[PDB]
Write a protein that binds this ligand. Sequence first.
Ligand SMILES: [Ca+2]
Length: 154
Amino acid sequence: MISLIAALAVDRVIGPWNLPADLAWFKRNTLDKPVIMGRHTWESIGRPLPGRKNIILSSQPGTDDRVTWVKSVDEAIAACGDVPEIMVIGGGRVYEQFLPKAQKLYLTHIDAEVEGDTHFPDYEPDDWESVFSEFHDADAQNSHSYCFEILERR
Ligand SMILES: [Ca+2]
């Protein structure tokens, strides 16, 4: 099964905060699972996420032997093999391709209105059921209030 995970500010801007807690959530949800990303996302991360299989989506040839390079959405899924759940880590463009096939979403709603580039694709209220929610305020470490949510395709 295919799963998308994203950290969204207000108005689904994914495109200012310092949320160690979210990185803690992100890591635990992805550990030991294939991670699919677009080249731009790969580029900002800058090194492979240790303990996951890293699959990069690009139209051109791979430039780094530390991850697996693929040329289509289909090949990306084939590269994962037989695992229970595949995690789509972004960005915008990969979100939009993967959304229609995703069965689960893992979101963090950050209270931070920013003017941004990429929005998380609109998902239909009707296709999703929230099966987990957990609200947390800003504290020492975390700069903003945020909410962990998990949705499932009904
Ligand atoms: Ca990203």
